[PDB]
Amino acid sequence: QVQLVESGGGVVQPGRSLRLSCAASGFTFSNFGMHWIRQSPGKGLEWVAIIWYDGSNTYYADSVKGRFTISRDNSKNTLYLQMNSLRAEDTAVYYCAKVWFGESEDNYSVDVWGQGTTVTVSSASTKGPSVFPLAPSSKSTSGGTAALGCLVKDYFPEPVTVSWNSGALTSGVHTFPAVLQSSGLYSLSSVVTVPSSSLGTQTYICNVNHKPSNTKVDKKVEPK
């Protein structure tokens, strides 16, 4: 069927430039106009730009007008978006989208969305996380169930992966979504409920992995 594949996203310092691409397949790309639409937690869904099938007419949102340039290569079936003078608030997930087919006098929007590529505009430098144990004790025990975890603090950028006992422990695991701090570093927690009768004897180790920095940390959580 119809398929759209975005590429080019990543971490970029403010003031620099970045070029996103969108590979289209399953249809005649040169016969359809295209949209770029971005989504952020602060603003929700937000349209960015539109281009005609032949590139003759282009439109941009007011917040990005004069900075972004949309283009296309119908011989390569590729859609491009050159983003210059990026600001911090441009951090979002960017989708390319295909205009639907309709009547000559109707209005138009998009029917098929791409996969999406994440763009994070921040002046923070790449930094590995600090892994601290959330040690269970009498104050974190209710009945026969206890809770333990790992705090993954002060890392940049996203994402990080957390496993327990090399993946052997998945029942009762809750990995919270990361939160962005005032320092531009992310932080999250991962918790797990275990039988209280196993505390002090069963070993629990959290394995944090960050491929962009090749960080691998195995932190053992011991009771107090």
Added chain:
Amino acid sequence: PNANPNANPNANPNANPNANPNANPNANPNANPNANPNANPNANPNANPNANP
């Protein structure tokens, strides 16, 4: 049985300000059949961006 020529010739403020649901719903044949000079002269952003085909 005639009309009082000195009666109220003004417009009753406490009259019916709503719309008349039984009024004329048809299209007026002898209405403005020409184009409007001060219509929209700008291109439509959400017009057809594809081929005919």
